[PDB]
UniProtKB/Swiss-Prot annotation:
Record bears the keyword Protease: yes
EC number: 3.4.23.22
Keywords: Aspartyl protease, Disulfide bond, Hydrolase, Protease, Signal, Zymogen
Domain of life assignment: Eukaryota
GO terms, biological process: proteolysis
Listed GO MF terms: aspartic-type endopeptidase activity
Protein name from the UniProt record: Endothiapepsin
Residues of the active site: 35, 199
Length: 330
């Protein structure tokens, strides 16, 4: 089997991407944030505290003929940005882009933090990291990908995120029309439960490539590119008037600037992030200070190849017995 679903930016900045997901019988379609940096599939629901719901579509298990309470199971998750959610668990039928899993754990939120409530466009998360990170207790649950894997034509999924445009998540096949040149594959460590890999270095604009190992995660659920302070300083030093602000919490720069590209290494290959991808617009409405898309990973404890980096590539998440990542230009 295979599946193929379109993923759409939630706003004009590509702050996140949403993908429609069918849950239950008859189908209830929710727009979920596919997150390769976490391992829970959780939704706004009929159980979510009413004051914490503001415009999201909810899953109502009592209206699904295939929903079953997973008796005694609870979940609670905290993300890198400080946001959180928790609740109880149902099993139900879940379909993505025509690929169906029966018996998927659907984590129903009883509580969500303010950042979720305030984002009316995201109805929940679908985690695509390794199932070792799933938070369900006392019986840990599998991700949608892990439950689908054995049925897929090939044990893979691909992320093809758009810049200010829709893109695609495919399951079970690699669309050879969706990228240019060849795919370069690189080793993955599952020791922390992430799609963790080592980039071979970077370049700023038309500058020389610096060969250096950068260990980080491929995380579709993180907006920006978080790299070591040395690398980030070298990037922003090429933009006149750019500076790290604490008041803002990151590098800002003149909205009048033209940003340089940023290149990262995948083995001997190179992925180029155009400068425009690094512009996250005014810090506040009407400001002439703009927020940068490359930021320091200092204090976060890991480097994160978030959407800024991933959207410049066709990315293959290879869940074979020894997982790997692949990257192609597009
Ligand atoms: C041969 C290798 C390399 O860069 O040395 N290469 C081109 C390559 O794609 O390696 C992919 C891979 C990594 C880990 C386990 C299996 C496969
Ligand atoms: Na922000």
């Amino acid at each position: 089997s295979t599946g193929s679903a379109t993923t759409t930016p939630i706003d004009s900045l590509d702050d996140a991407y949403i993908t429609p997901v069918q849950i239950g019988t008859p189908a209830q379609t929710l727009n979920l944030d596919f997150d390769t940096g976490s391992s829970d599939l959780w939704v706004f629901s009929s159980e979510t505290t009413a004051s914490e719901v503001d415009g999201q579509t909810i899953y109502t298990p009592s209206k699904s003929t295939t929903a079953k309470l997973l008796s005694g199971a609870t979940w609670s998750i905290s993300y890198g940005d400080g946001s959180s959610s928790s609740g109880d668990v149902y099993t139900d039928t879940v379909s993505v882009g025509g690929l169906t899993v029966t018996g998927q754990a659907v984590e129903s939120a009883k509580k969500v933090s303010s950042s979720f409530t305030e984002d009316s466009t995201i109805d929940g998360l679908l985690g695509l990291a390794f199932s070792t990170l799933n938070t369900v207790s006392p019986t840990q649950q599998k991700t949608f990908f892990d439950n689908a894997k054995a049925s897929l034509d090939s044990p893979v999924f691909t992320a093809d995120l758009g810049y200010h445009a829709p893109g695609t998540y495919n399951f079970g096949f690699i669309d050879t029309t969706a990228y240019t040149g060849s795919i370069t594959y690189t080793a993955v460590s599952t020791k922390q439960g992430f799609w963790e890999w080592t980039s071979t270095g970077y370049a700023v604009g038309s500058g020389t490539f610096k060969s250096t190992s950068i260990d980080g995660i491929a995380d579709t659920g993180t907006t920006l590119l978080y790299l070591p302070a040395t690398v980030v300083s070298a990037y922003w030093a090429q933009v006149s008037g750019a500076k790290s602000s604490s008041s803002v919490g990151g590098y800002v720069f003149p909205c009048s600037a033209t940003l340089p590209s940023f290149t990262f290494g995948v083995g001997s290959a190179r992925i180029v992030i155009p400068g425009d991808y690094i512009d996250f617009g005014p810090i506040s409405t009407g400001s002439s200070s703009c927020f940068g898309g490359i930021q320091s990973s200092a204090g976060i404890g890991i480097n994160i190849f978030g959407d800024v980096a991933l959207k410049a590539a066709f990315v293959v998440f290879n869940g074979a017995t020894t997982p790997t990542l692949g990257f192609a230009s597009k």
